[PDB]
Structure formats: structure tokens, C-alpha cells
């Protein structure tokens with residue numbers, strides 16, 4: 001990463017081939033944009049610094065980390081960068097027009113059935129348990145990929161998951177105590193296992209169809225103490241019993257007792273296969 005030089009021949013993109021559009025977030029800022037000849041004209045998301053040496057290294061590190069990590073279907077894809085003199089540092093990635101998963105699920109609350117049967121058009125475009133388990137499975141394969149390369153996300157949450165074309169989700173980072181593991185809060189310790197705690201919170205978000213975690217709770221000292229003491233969220237409204245138990249496994253007090261992402265990939269894959277088998281029967285009988 002920060003040790004591996006930046007290969008300009010491969011990634012460098014001309015600033016004048018970029019037409020900056022509207023903001024997607026502001027914190028540096030992330031804006032939508034049209035890129036000509038990046039891969040003729042295509043939509044992309046750009047992260048650029050304001051017109052600070054520290055903030056500069058941060059964006060440059062994100063860039064180097066992205067090149068290093070490489071490609072995976074469930075991780076937003078890097079397309080290029082503007083790093084040479086003449087203008088601001090810019091990191092360009094594929095644009096996901098559908099936005100973050102939380103806001104998307106929140107918009108489908110009146111379009112959900114656990115599964116479909118004929119006539120299926122009654123549920124055209126509805127979300128189902130298959131979709132929810134599939135989103136979870138994809139994020140897990142995405143994190144397994146990152147974990148295999150020793151990468152730690154730090155802010156894994158629904159707002160950082162993006163929806164793509166055919167129900168494909170991608171892990172991103174626009175760059176939140178409610179998603180933080182106890183040891184992260186009390187010890188400022190970040191590890192792959194603290195990302196597992198977060199995944200657990202993401203699962204809750206998914207099976208509550210975009211609700212904000214810990215509903216009706218002030219995030220004060222008591223919240224933190226209870227978390228440390230073993231208090232957990234109750235099951236969301238659209239969860240199956242297995243999925244809620246998986247959340248609980250991710251919220252184990254001892255980081256070493258939580259499952260790994262490889263185990264979650266395998267486990268979620270099975271819950272998906274079971275759900276599918278159940279569905280074929282439901283469909284065949286009704």
C-alpha cells in the first residue's frame with residue numbers, strides 16, 4: 001500500500017476528461033461526475049480534497065489501499081485517479097446510482113413478502129427473505145475478501161453498502177458508536193473481529209429493512225455500560241430465527257468467540273440455500 005508506489009501508467013486519468021456533478025456527501029467531498037474514456041462516457045463517483053498535507057496523505061492512502069486490495073464483485077471498483085500536478089488529488093470509482101442500502105430498504109417497507117408464489121406479478125419488484133439473505137451473503141463475501149488481505153473497514157454499516165444493478169451490493173466507504181464493538185469503544189482497539197460486531201449491526205439493519213439501530217435509546221454512558229454488561233438489541237421485524245442468532249454470535253463479548261467472515265460466508269450461504277429450497281416447494285404447491 002503506502003509502501004507500494006502508485007503506478008500512474010495504469011491508473012492516472014486526465015482532469016479535463018472529468019465533468020463534476022452534484023455532491024453525494026460532504027465531509028473533502030464526494031461528488032457524482034461524468035468521465036470520458038475512463039474505461040465512451042460513464043458515470044463515476046469522485047473523492048477530492050478541498051483547495052492540508054495530512055488530509056492529502058489520507059486520500060492518497062485510500063487510493064494506494066484500493067489498488068493493493070484489488071478487485072472483487074462486492075467491493076466498489078476503483079477506476080482511476082488524478083494525482084499529478086495541475087489540480088486537486090482525486091480518487092475515482094464506479095458510481096452506484098441506487099445509493100446506500102439503508103435508504104433503499106427503508107423505501108421498500110410496503111413492498112415485502114417473505115417469498116413469492118404464482119401469480120408472481122402480485123409482488124413485482126418486492127423484497128423477499130431471499131433478497132435480504134442475499135445482501136447479507138454478498139457483504140460477507142466482500143468482508144471475507146478484505147479480511148483475507150488484512151484490511152479492517154472500521155465503519156461497516158448499511159450507509160456504507162451500495163446497491164448495484166441486479167441486486168448486487170458493494171462495500172464502500174464515504175469516509176457512530178451504535179456500530180462500534182465494546183473493545184473499540186472502551187479500548188480504541190480495531191480488528192477484523194470488531195468489524196464482525198459491526199456486520200452483526202448491519203444484519204440487524206438489513207432485517208429491520210433500514211431501521212436505525214437501538215431504537216428509542218439515548219447513546220449516553222448508560223448505553224455503553226449496558227453494551228459492556230451484555231445487553232443486546234432485540235430481533236428486528238423481518239428476521240428469521242437463524243439470522244437473529246447469527247447477529248447474537250457477532251455480538252459476543254469476547255472478540256475471539258465471534259465467527260470469522262469465512263464462517264459467516266459459509267453459514268449465510270447455507271441459510272440462503274435452505275431458503276431457496278423452501279421457496280421452490282412453496283412455489284410448487286401454490
Ligand SMILES: CC1(C)CNc2cc(NC(=O)c3cccnc3NCc3ccncc3)ccc21
Pocket residue numbers: 024030045046047062065066069075076091092093094095096097146151153162171172173174
Ligand atoms: C473499505 C475500503 C476497501 C477501504 N477504504 C475504502 C474506500 C472506498 N472508497 C469509496 O467508497 C469512494 C471513493 C471515491 C469516491 N466515492 C467513494 N464512495 C462513495 C460512492 C461510491 C459509489 N457511488 C456513490 C458513492 C471504497 C472501499 C474502501
